[model samples]
Target: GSSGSSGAAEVGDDFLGDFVVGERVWVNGVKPGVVQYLGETQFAPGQWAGVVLDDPVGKNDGAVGGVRYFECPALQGIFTRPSKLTRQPSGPSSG
Candidate 1:
């Protein structure tokens, strides 16, 4: 894993096993949401992730400034750091 093809591989970044779009993810360590965006966002100057919460627990609505990243309702859309996300469906790991 050290051949370095494009040299664009992860380097101490959000490589906590990158989550896929349209997959279920745990956000903010306390809410359930589905991933809708997984790339650089215009609102910020770095890579960002967006999701739609299972419950109405947001005011961001996936938009910032003048762009919308997620296609969710006002109270269901949210964006946060990838460090605060998880791919576990039940989030019950016994190891």
Candidate 2:
């Protein structure tokens, strides 16, 4: 049931909020990551945040559309919309 894209929404997306570089965040509701690059993208015509997950659970390695947004281990990089990312706090996040 993963990777479903049958009812995708609008294409003109934006970050929608201010995010600092290297800020830790939780993407897609659960996955934890960091913001490496946040801005317009060549792969998509909109604002995107490039993040590197703590585990090898990303779509690509920060390399999309013949570009390298950031360098990370295999399967650890991902680009997502700001709506899906929430800033992570410092120190140990006991959850």
- Top candidate by TM-score: 2
lDDT of each: 0.65, 0.71
**In model 1, which runs have C-alpha deviations exceeding 4 angstroms?**
1-17, 89-95
lDDT of 2 by residue, 8-91 (tens): 342426545577788788886676787888877656676677788899998777766566778889788877887667765434
In model 2, where is the ten-residue run with the lowest total lDDT? 1-10
Name the TM-score of candidate 2: 0.74
User: lDDT score of model 2?
Assistant: 0.71
Cα miss at 34, model 2 (Å)?
1.1
Candidate 2 regions exceeding 4 Å error are 1-12, 88-95
